[PDB]
């Protein structure tokens, strides 16, 4: 539960949102 | 942009949200 880990998982979340939106032709 | 791909990226998004929330001690 470190900030190191939270920060990593948040950035990976941001990437994965983008990946979905690109697959949807929205980004 | 297939549904195959959207469905995959959506499920990966769901997993990654969960991963963040577990790192945050919220799940």
Residue numbers in the entry:
A (entry chain A), B (entry chain A): 2 to 3, 726 to 750
Publication passage describing the model:
PLK4, and this interaction targets STIL to centrioles. allows homo-multimerisation, the interaction with the PB3 domain of PLK4, or both. structures and interactions of CCDs and PLK4-PB3s in humans and flies.
characterise this difference, we sought to solve the structure of the HsCCD. coiled-coil dimer of dimers generated by crystallographic symmetry. as an antiparallel dimer of dimers. dimeric form we observe in our structure. concentration and varies between dimeric to nearly tetrameric. reached that of a tetramer at higher concentrations (4000 µM). which is involved in both the dimerisation and PB3 interfaces. and binding to PB3 are likely mutually exclusive. that can readily dissociate to interact with PB3.
